[PDB]
């Protein structure tokens, strides 16, 4: 009943059981994934999180937690597809759990710039961020076919799907990501 569902991508898998859970690393007392979720909730009413470890911890802030299908597909696309299979509604705005400064015009600018394409993603002036992406429902069967073919490459898929980059180069540093606990330590 709203137009775009926001989605925090907190990562797959768990060949990572027993490793750092990056989305739960805290920045000024608040888990990174919640900084992303809170920024998406500024701009969208309905926001969910895709998480495959520590689900109970993710569930404690009261948002729906969506787990990957047993297919165990690789990479960020697998989370996107699991969310589309488990949520209704025609558009999704995905964002990884490690980019806590995303701006309040993310959804609005991606939508303004979509120009009829079924997918658009953020370019920050230096690089594409193809997991920060506004995706139409119609992508679901193409994603399923691509992952069932054993493919994983995110940019390749976005290109095959007819998407384009949207220029956010004027948003200084809104798209910086925390790659490691070492980097997080610097942003405190
Ligand atoms: Li653990």
- Domains of the chain are 1-188 (3.90.550.10)
| DSSP secondary structure code for residue 105 in this structure | T
Please give the Cα distance from 151 to 26 (Å, whole number): 33
**Does 124 appear as a known binding residue?**
no
Technique used: X-ray
Torsion of CA 101, 105, 108, 113, to 10 degrees: -80
Please give the Cα distance from 98 to 101 (Å, whole number): 9
User: Any alpha helices (H) in 53-176, and if so which ranges?
Assistant: 55-59, 76-86, 106-112, 139-148, 154-160
Residue 20 CA to ligand 1 centre (angstroms): 8
**Count of C-beta atoms within a 10 Å radius of residue 1:** 6
Please give the Cα distance from 163 to 88 (Å, whole number): 21
Residue 54 CA to ligand 1 centre (angstroms): 8
Please state, in angstroms and as integers, the Cα–Cα distance from residue 169 to each residue in 98, 104, 128, 129, 150, following that order. Answer: 19, 15, 10, 12, 33
**Does 30 appear as a known binding residue?**
no
Please state, in angstroms and as integers, the Cα–Cα distance from residue 107 to each residue in 2, 50, 164, following that order. Answer: 13, 19, 15
Residue 127 CA to ligand 1 centre (angstroms): 33
Contact 76, 13 (CB under 8 A): no
For residue 108, give the nearest of 161, 172, 44 by alpha carbon: 44
């Amino acid at each position: 009943m709203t137009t775009i569902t926001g989605v925090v991508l907190a990562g797959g898998k768990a060949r990572r059981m027993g490793l750092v859970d990056k989305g739960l690393l805290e920045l000024n007392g608040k888990p990174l994934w919640q900084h992303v979720a809170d920024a998406l909730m500024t701009q969208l009413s309905h926001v969910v999180v895709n998480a495959n470890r520590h689900q109970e911890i993710y569930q404690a802030s009261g948002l729906k937690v969506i787990e990957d299908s047993l297919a165990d597909y690789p990479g960020p696309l697998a989370g996107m597809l699991s969310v589309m299979q488990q949520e209704a509604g025609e558009w999704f705005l995905f964002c990884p759990c490690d980019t806590p400064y995303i701006p309040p015009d993310l959804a609005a600018r991606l939508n303004h710039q979509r120009k009829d394409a079924p997918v658009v993603w953020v370019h920050d002036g230096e690089r594409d961020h193809p997991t920060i992406a506004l995706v139409n429902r119609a992508i679901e069967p193409l994603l399923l076919e691509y992952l069932q073919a054993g493919e994983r490459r995110v940019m390749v898929f976005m290109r095959l799907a007819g998407g384009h980059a949207v220029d956010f180069s004027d948003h200084k540093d809104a798209f910086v990501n925390v790659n490691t606990p070492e980097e997080l330590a610097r942003w405190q």
